[PDB]
C-alpha cells in the first residue's frame, strides 16, 4: 500500500549510475523507507499546527517539529526558513 513511486525510484538508482544492476526488492525497500521518514516529519510538522493553533503547514511548523524530536535533528541537520 506504498504511496511512494517504487518504479520512479528504480530509475533514479540505475540512471544515477549508483550501481549497474538493481534487484527488484531494492527500490521497493528504499520506497517504504523514504515514505516512513515522510510519515515522521509529517506526523510531527502537522502536530506543530495544533501547538501553533494553525493549519497551513509553513516553512516554520516543520523546523520546530524537527528540533523537538532528538533523532530527526542529527539526521536532517539544522533547518532555516
Amino acid at each position: 500500500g506504498l504511496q511512494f513511486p517504487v518504479g520512479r525510484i528504480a530509475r533514479f538508482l540505475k540512471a544515477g549510475k549508483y550501481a549497474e544492476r538493481v534487484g527488484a526488492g531494492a527500490p521497493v525497500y528504499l520506497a517504504a523507507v523514504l515514505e516512513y521518514l515522510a510519515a515522521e516529519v509529517l506526523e510531527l510538522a502537522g502536530n506543530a499546527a495544533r501547538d501553533n493553533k494553525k493549519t497551513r503547514i509553513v516553512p516554520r511548523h516543520i523546523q520546530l517539529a524537527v528540533r523537538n524530536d532528538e533523532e530527526l535533528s542529527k539526521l536532517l541537520g539544522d533547518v532555516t526558513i
Binding site: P5, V33, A38, L42, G46, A49, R56, I57
Partner: protein
C-alpha cells in the same frame, strides 16, 4: 539533480493529518529532505554493492535461463508470465 517526491508527500500527509495542508516553500523543504536521504542511502548502498564481489541471481538471469532452456513458444509464454509476476510485485 533534484527529483520531485511531492505528489507522494501530499498522499502521506492526507493519512497522518487528513485535514491539514502545506505552503509552497514548506513542501519544497520536505522534498529537499527526501532528496538529501535518497543520496545518503543510494551512495552508501553503492559502496556496499561494490565491496561485495559475490554474484547475484536477479530476474534478468532467470529470464535468459528461460530462453536457453525452454523451447520456442513455451519460452515466449514463460517470459510473458514471469515478467508479469515481477511487474505486479513492483507496482
Amino acid at each position: 539533480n533534484v527529483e520531485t517526491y511531492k505528489i507522494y508527500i501530499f498522499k502521506v500527509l492526507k493519512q497522518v493529518h487528513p485535514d491539514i495542508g502545506i505552503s509552497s516553500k514548506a513542501m519544497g523543504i520536505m522534498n529537499s529532505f527526501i532528496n538529501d536521504i535518497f543520496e545518503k542511502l543510494a551512495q552508501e548502498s553503492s559502496k556496499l554493492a561494490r565491496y561485495n564481489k559475490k554474484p547475484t541471481i536477479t530476474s534478468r538471469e532467470i529470464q535468459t535461463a528461460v530462453r536457453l532452456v525452454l523451447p520456442g513458444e513455451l519460452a515466449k509464454h514463460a517470459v510473458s508470465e514471469g515478467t508479469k509476476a515481477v511487474t505486479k510485485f513492483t507496482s
